[PDB]
Amino acid sequence: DIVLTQSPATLSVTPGDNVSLSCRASQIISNNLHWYQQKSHESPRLLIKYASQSISGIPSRFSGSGSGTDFTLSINSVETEDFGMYFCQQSNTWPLTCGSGTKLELN
Amino acid sequence: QIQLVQSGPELKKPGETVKISCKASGYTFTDYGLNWVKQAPGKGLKWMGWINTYSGEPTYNDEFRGRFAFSLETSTITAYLKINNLKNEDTATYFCARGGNWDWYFDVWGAGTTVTVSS
Amino acid sequence: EVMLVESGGGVVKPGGSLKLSCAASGFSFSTYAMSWIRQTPEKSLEWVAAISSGGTNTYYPGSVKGRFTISRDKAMNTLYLQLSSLRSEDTAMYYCVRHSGNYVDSVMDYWGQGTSVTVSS
Amino acid sequence: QIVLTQSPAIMSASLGEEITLTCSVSSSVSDMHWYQQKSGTSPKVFIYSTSNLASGVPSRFSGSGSGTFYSLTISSVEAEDAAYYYCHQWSSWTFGGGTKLEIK
Amino acid sequence: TNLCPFGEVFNATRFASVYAWNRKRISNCVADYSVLYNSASFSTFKCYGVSPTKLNDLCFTNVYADSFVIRGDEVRQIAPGQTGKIADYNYKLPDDFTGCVIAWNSNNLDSKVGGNYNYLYRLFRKSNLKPFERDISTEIYYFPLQSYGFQPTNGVGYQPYRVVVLSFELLHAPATVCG
Ligand SMILES: *[C@@H]1O[C@H](CO)[C@@H](O[C@@H]2O[C@H](CO)[C@@H](O[C@@H]3O[C@H](CO)[C@@H](O)[C@H](O)[C@@H]3O)[C@H](O)[C@H]2NC(C)=O)[C@H](O)[C@H]1NC(C)=O
Numbered sequence A: 001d002i003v004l005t006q007s008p009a010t011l012s013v014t015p016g017d018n019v020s021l022s023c024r025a026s027q028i029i030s031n032n033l034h035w036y037q038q039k040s041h042e043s044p045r046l047l048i049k050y051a052s053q054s055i056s057g058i059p060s061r062f063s064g065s066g067s068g069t070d071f072t073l074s075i076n077s078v079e080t081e082d083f084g085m086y087f088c089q090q091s092n093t094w095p096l097t098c099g100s101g102t103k104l105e106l107n
Numbered sequence B: 001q002i003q004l005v006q007s008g009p010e011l012k013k014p015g016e017t018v019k020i021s022c023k024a025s026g027y028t029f030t031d032y033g034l035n036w037v038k039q040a041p042g043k044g045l046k047w048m049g050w051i052n053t054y055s056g057e058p059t060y061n062d063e064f065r066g067r068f069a070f071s072l073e074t075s076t077i078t079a080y081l082k083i084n085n086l087k088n089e090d091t092a093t094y095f096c097a098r099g100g101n102w103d104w105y106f107d108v109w110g111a112g113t114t115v116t117v118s119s
Numbered sequence C: 001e002v003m004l005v006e007s008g009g010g011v012v013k014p015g016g017s018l019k020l021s022c023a024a025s026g027f028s029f030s031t032y033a034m035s036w037i038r039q040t041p042e043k044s045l046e047w048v049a050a051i052s053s054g055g056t057n058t059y060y061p062g063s064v065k066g067r068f069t070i071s072r073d074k075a076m077n078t079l080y081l082q083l084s085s086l087r088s089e090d091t092a093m094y095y096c097v098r099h100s101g102n103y104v105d106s107v108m109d110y111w112g113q114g115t116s117v118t119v120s121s
Numbered sequence D: 001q002i003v004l005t006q007s008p009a010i011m012s013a014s015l016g017e018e019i020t021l022t023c024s025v026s027s028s029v030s031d032m033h034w035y036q037q038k039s040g041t042s043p044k045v046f047i048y049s050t051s052n053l054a055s056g057v058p059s060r061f062s063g064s065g066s067g068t069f070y071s072l073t074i075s076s077v078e079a080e081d082a083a084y085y086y087c088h089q090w091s092s093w094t095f096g097g098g099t100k101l102e103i104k
Numbered sequence E: 001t002n003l004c005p006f007g008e009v010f011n012a013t014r015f016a017s018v019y020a021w022n023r024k025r026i027s028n029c030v031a032d033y034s035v036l037y038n039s040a041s042f043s044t045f046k047c048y049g050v051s052p053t054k055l056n057d058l059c060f061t062n063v064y065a066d067s068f069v070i071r072g073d074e075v076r077q078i079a080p081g082q083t084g085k086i087a088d089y090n091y092k093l094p095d096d097f098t099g100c101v102i103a104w105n106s107n108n109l110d111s112k113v114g115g116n117y118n119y120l121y122r123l124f125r126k127s128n129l130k131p132f133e134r135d136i137s138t139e140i141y142y143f144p145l146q147s148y149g150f151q152p153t154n155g156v157g158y159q160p161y162r163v164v165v166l167s168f169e170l171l172h173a174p175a176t177v178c179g
Helices: none
Strands: A023-029 A033-038 A045-048 A063-065 A068-075 A084-090 A102-104 B004-006 B018-024 B037-039 B049-051 B058-060 B078-083 B093-095 C003-005 C017-025 C034-039 C045-051 C069-072 C078-084 C092-099 C108-111 C115-117 D010-012 D019-021 D034-037 D044-048 D064-066 D069-074 D084-086 D099-102 E044-047 E066-071 E100-103 E120-122 E145-147 E160-165
Touching (some): A023 A033, A023 A084, A045 A063, C017 C092, C017 C115, C045 C069, C078 C092, C108 D044
Parallel strands (some): D010 D099
Antiparallel strands (some): A023 A068, A033 A084, A063 A068, A084 A102, B004 B018, B037 B093, C003 C017, C034 C045, C034 C092, C069 C078, C092 C108, D034 D084, D084 D099, E044 E100
8 A cells, every 4th residue: 555755744934935845655646646734633624636626715825736656735925824734645546545744833 | 514513522441332423414425425534643644444325335444454343324314433342542533524436535524533542 | 956945934014124044955055146036916026135156245226225134154055135124015025046157147047935025014 | 227128018829829029128238038937936047148048948939139129939839838927137126027928 | 576566456446437448567577366366356257368276377578457447237248259339449359368357346436326427438439449459539420428327226237347457468578477
């Protein structure tokens, strides 16, 4: 099965910066990666689907691109509530599995 | 509205059996199956396997093979989780996620039951 | 010679349950597939259940879905079909058939005698 | 889904005649079996794979057909052959309406 | 001792449709087919030139794992020597096909009560087709790419049967896949 490594383990941002994130795989999937964001001790939500598209209710800076085996989530000019834990999980092979996790922290 | 109302917290002793409910509403129950996610504290998520929302057959992960069961009755819109032989390491939140039967992204989630086990 | 018998067909009021059992004798049991067909009082057949050779795959139509749980036995060379949560139309004569191939796709050669279950009062 | 229409409900055939029995499908299936049931006994098999004959049945029950049409041929009708006849394919969930062959 | 990635073609969420089947070329593997054969969760395991217990201990150079989704009634006609609605317009095998065809029942995933209208099959063509060849040409013949009308309660011959078709091949090259 695939394992998903996020790097690095933590971040340190000031509000208003354009900083991107990294989720790399161990198999090559045809853009079947999604992206989740979980705050403290509650349920995560969906941000973008299939690593390039997006759904309603999402702020405009949350967009991702790139297919293959290395994928990057790009957020620009971040907000004072977008911080927390961010997740990537793939949907190509079985069983489904999520990434280890990063922590978006505000300086 | 579309939501997945859940059960409340639990507190068991090692050797018991829990039953966690997850009731759906709004959307028609046959178009989208359900999932289960075990979030160990300070850890990543794990996909506990899905359940076909019409027929009722589960499909477990390769790691949660024994000691689990995905029951379901469709007279009332309600799906269960049954955990046999509770051990010391199964203390986590257990969400239920509305993953589709053609897409497999967990679109709309629930609340989660922070179950705890103690001697 | 291939020999199939049936039993358990009684009377249950609607809402109750009943278990049948088709005992097989005369062939290698764990290699061929079996299925259960009911016969309406207007004599129109339809499947209610079908199980493959290894007991891994079960199929039921949309009219009896969720309650008719078929089961195969390895040891004592019988075959159980369990029914529950009956309705007013499910009174029928229930045969026990055997396929010739190791899946459900092949034809049904040997048939049982068939019990008649009645839902009334 | 699939429905199996057999028209009419009862075909008429006095002895010595050659009659055929129909079986049609809505969506095109690859083959169609043929079952025979008398009044009071369990049904038995006559023809599988649209042309092959089952065990212990005389050599006048040889049908044919493909696509959306499957025919059941009997050359010399005998008065013992007065039974309800069903055709049923793997992809059905429901048998045909059943046609009983009577002797005029 | 590295084992062949069969998990990327036996364990996939969305198998492609029959007219646009995905092909995965395999080389420099070690393929223990006894893990495949002794799984017993497959419906039709037909082999067409090697015996299904004998296929372990002989080498090859490149084996193609074609894979697609067809109706259960049509799994038999992707054998060699049979021509039907599937086997002359979508996927046709040559008469000296060397390999095993593996299929099973998959009513769990690919079924919705309103329908699963995304698996497509080429109904009409101008002429017949030469084996091991595909054509994604969605031009008017009369729109040819009709979809399978799938349902959870439709028929055991009309449930989707996800079939992966191996294709062994030995050419003038050093054979690698032995096991
Ligand atoms: C495709 O995925 C399925 C899972 O959905 C794979 O089935 C699982 O395969 C693993 C190993 O490939 C089996 O694990 C083994 O289980 C035995 C106990 O039976 C254990 O002692 C071993 O140490 C090992 O962990 C697992 O049992 C099996 N599960 C089922 C339900 O079959 C399947 O192998 C995959 N297909 C491939 C790789 O071609």
